[PDB]
Amino acid sequence: IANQPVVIDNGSGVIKAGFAGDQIPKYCFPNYVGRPKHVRVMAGALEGDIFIGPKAEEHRGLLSIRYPMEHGIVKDWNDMERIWQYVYSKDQLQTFSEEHPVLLTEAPLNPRKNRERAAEVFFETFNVPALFISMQAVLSLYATGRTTGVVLDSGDGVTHAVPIYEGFAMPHSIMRIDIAGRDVSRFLRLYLRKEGYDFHSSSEFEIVKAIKERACYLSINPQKDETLETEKAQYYLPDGSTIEIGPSRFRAPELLFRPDLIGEESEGIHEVLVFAIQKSDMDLRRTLFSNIVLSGGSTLFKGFGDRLLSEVKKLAPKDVKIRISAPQERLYSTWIGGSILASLDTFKKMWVSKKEYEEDGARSIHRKTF
Amino acid sequence: IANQPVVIDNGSGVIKAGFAGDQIPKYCFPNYVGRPKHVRVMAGALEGDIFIGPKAEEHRGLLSIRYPMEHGIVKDWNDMERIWQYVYSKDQLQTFSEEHPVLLTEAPLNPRKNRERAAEVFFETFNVPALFISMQAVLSLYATGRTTGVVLDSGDGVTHAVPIYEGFAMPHSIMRIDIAGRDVSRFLRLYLRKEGYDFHSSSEFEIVKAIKERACYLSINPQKDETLETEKAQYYLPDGSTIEIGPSRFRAPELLFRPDLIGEESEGIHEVLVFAIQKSDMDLRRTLFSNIVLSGGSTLFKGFGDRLLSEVKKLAPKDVKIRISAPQERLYSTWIGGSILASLDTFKKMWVSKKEYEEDGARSIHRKTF
Amino acid sequence: IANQPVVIDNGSGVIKAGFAGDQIPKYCFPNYVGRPKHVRVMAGALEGDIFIGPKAEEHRGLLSIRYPMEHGIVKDWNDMERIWQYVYSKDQLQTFSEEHPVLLTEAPLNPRKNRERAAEVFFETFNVPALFISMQAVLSLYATGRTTGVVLDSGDGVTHAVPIYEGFAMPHSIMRIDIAGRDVSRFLRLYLRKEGYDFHSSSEFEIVKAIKERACYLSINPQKDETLETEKAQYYLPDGSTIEIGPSRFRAPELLFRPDLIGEESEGIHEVLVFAIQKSDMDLRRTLFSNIVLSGGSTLFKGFGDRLLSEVKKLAPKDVKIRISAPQERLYSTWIGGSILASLDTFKKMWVSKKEYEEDGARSIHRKTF
Amino acid sequence: DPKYADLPGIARNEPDVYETSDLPQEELTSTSVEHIIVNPNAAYDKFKDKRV
């Protein structure tokens, strides 16, 4: 059985979908898990009353949105259950897991119960013939065509650099960090209450994140630009409400490199990248200086890479050529690299048959991921 | 087995009644409790000592009319029975309490004790097989067919901004202000003494209502149209006399937007609806202007919604697209929507079973209506 | 200045006033902002036309009582000025701003704009030399003598546990929330309409508040006591008009733990306290379990803290010994603690020299108010 | 309309609907980034031959 392989982008920030060979992820939508905030009495509301998809994508303040992916790690598997049921929706795919080769992705260092649980679903409820839960930076290696390289990722509450070389077992040098825009936008809600902007809902948070993705730049100088006089850009809400900003628009992404703003003890992912460089060797370091990849949808900012490049230069060694390759569509690029790997038929060794999962499971996971 | 229900559209001031599936409430007359005021003498002098309809119009200043519906909230339950008996009679129903299912209308957030009192009537004195009483706004929405909709409607001594959306129970956003045209007629009585007219009878009040619903409207400018010199429209009294009017006719509904004239700390129900909008969600608020539903015979006036349009223009910010929907049968829109639900088999799940009321009552009543 | 330092008891609902060294706040009064609802055409009536004190605390329905602290966040400013002029009234002070050191208290995360307004007031209108603006829970720690503790405030529309440890700046760990009994009493006005009580005035709301502060409590068993039926004890109006109390007395304050009754998603601030616990550390958590403070007027209910004890018992794990501390003088704890801090020599460095502070802008004490 | 003629308690000259007026990324070009495109078909068929 070799039908078209399912490309399952396991997007923590924004989940994406489609099959291999498709040069564009057909279905793309975030981590939102809704069901109505209110209670409908008269008919006129839609049916299912746990909505994810266009209904949720058109009724924000109506559905009680939730998120199981605590730092991209789903806790409410039930949400994923319904999501995967929605994967074969009449709008979506209308097919079977049984009917297709399936491919999964995974940010490393997650607790084994996560991918084990997911595989339980896909081999018990769903019944995939052959599958595998790959990593996520390899997708970017396909998108770049590279083999050697540092790959930064960006979900919603997860961001980390992945130093790679031709797919080699370097997990100590390879890093993982679970922090991103989720709490940055929550910190933006903090800014809101800091200056009287009354905002607390999840749908309200969606609006906040939309404007965050919209009205938030990155000033290269941290305090030299942070201590300036702000114009407080009056963002007129989608409803029409005029709302100023302040330096907060670039202050909140500094937290990603100034974790002490929230009080977290960290270094800045670029410093962790430097630690990965230290974990690598002098010859391989230069390659990584030349090979850096920024990916993930949360990386989208104004003055983003120039600032981070400058910060790296502030911490880089003597005149070593720092080079960051970049995919223009960091959201797409991931799913598309996964589409490449799914369309790669050498996966025969790399997959996991259903029977094998029934026999071992965890052992089959490790022995096939290593 | 059940029978054909009777779509009975009540209200704070006017009751409408017809069977299921009909297009016209065949039995319409206002909500009033009349009974004689004089010493009966000769033979043939109509006994019953409570008269409604042709007898009411026939003996206007001869029958003491009562209105126990304290803004719809009635207190002469015994007389309510008799009103229904008048309907039960060969005049209107020609049937029994058990011969047909009943349909009835309910204003929002009234004291449950009243409802329960009516249930005592309907299932002990009267014996309804199955019934259900709910929001008139919902019925009006059935008539419009809309599901997403802020229903602005007013009874006769009750006003109520009802922001609804696909049957979603949003009682926090949903409001009601139990004051309307009954008091505007009382305010017209105030105008009567302001021009020296002691026409305080209930029949005199009916004459006041006739001219009220007859000669009044909403001038869009308040004092630009009020402070000028009037013509004092010589309204020819039906008696054969004539009384002038002046600006008073359009000055009276200004009180509906300026409750300070009567000394009331309301806001002009349109502003209360704006607050209801403020209790909703930002971009959904935009849709509420599109989801504008207007009703109420009390609201049937020239430039009514137009003045209200200007009001909201002076209240709502930009990017607001009001979409008024006020037919010529807003009264019957509730009755016709009741006929729609009467044509719906959803009532089988939405009834008020006699048996369960006999078993529990109050708790079962709220379990039936909620 | 070498005088008695003023301790502003800037209470949300009840904004009292006083000095340092004293154990009783000089004058106690709420956020009432009255202006007569009529016109004294007859000479010989009472002056003022703005009422703070027994003038309003004696006549309520005659005056358009107002309240600008939108969950503590005051919107009026001119009225506040006049309130502070009244602070210097004959009965009140007969002193000068220059003549006395003044200390202001505030809720955390308030807008800087309010402090700017206060600077304008006490530096342009008033001229306090020693003016400092502070927090409110620190005051409670002064009164209790504790340094480590979970301080739960209880205002009219502001309640939030403040987990402190020796004054350590834990803004991320510490949680602020602006909601309390205001809309609970208003929700009881909703109950009033559901029980037939036509009340719409803030004065009427104050009478309901007299019931709130008087005939209300927290039933530790939520539905075990809610699903039952009380005898609905009767409350007497200022006239003495008999009005039943009902189950509402404990049903309405459940919204404080069940915020979805109003529809607003929240937790019941004890769970937010648990979130603060999560932000804290394991054994330091135990200290704060043993260190919980209950201040604010709205804490006064039967089984209040005991019900919350049961809540955390249903939340905290096993062998978790928790201890609360609810001083009898909840609001005064803040006031007396302000008297304590205002009576300090180190406290002289807390404020900034008046004129220079005006020249320093506001950001200086904005950075120094932590 | 026919129902509007049917019952007497029906007002006339009503434009039932009254509406108001009505009228009718940047860092992919950022200099310091070495932003690359892919054309996955070519590189896919290229690396596709890597039977590993």
Ligand SMILES: Nc1ncnc2c1ncn2[C@@H]1O[C@H](COP(=O)(O)OP(=O)(O)O)[C@@H](O)[C@H]1O
């Ligand atoms: N301009 C922007 N600024 C910040 N975040 C953005 C922007 N555009 C998209 N996003 C983010 O895209 C992210 C999606 O990440 P994604 O690429 O799907 O990573 P993953 O696949 O690991 O979830 C969301 O977290 C959302 O915050």
Ligand SMILES: Nc1ncnc2c1ncn2[C@@H]1O[C@H](COP(=O)(O)OP(=O)(O)O)[C@@H](O)[C@H]1O
């Ligand atoms: N043309 C009119 N102008 C003003 N008032 C009217 C007109 N027609 C009817 N009314 C009054 O307005 C009320 C209609 O609003 P509706 O919601 O049907 O009231 P109710 O709920 O009192 O039956 C009627 O009770 C009637 O007294």
Ligand SMILES: Nc1ncnc2c1ncn2[C@@H]1O[C@H](COP(=O)(O)OP(=O)(O)O)[C@@H](O)[C@H]1O
């Ligand atoms: N006996 C009482 N029971 C319940 N609430 C009370 C009592 N006495 C005062 N209050 C409440 O105190 C609140 C007044 O707000 P206040 O406590 O002054 O704000 P802050 O906490 O900022 O000082 C109101 O909620 C009022 O109901």
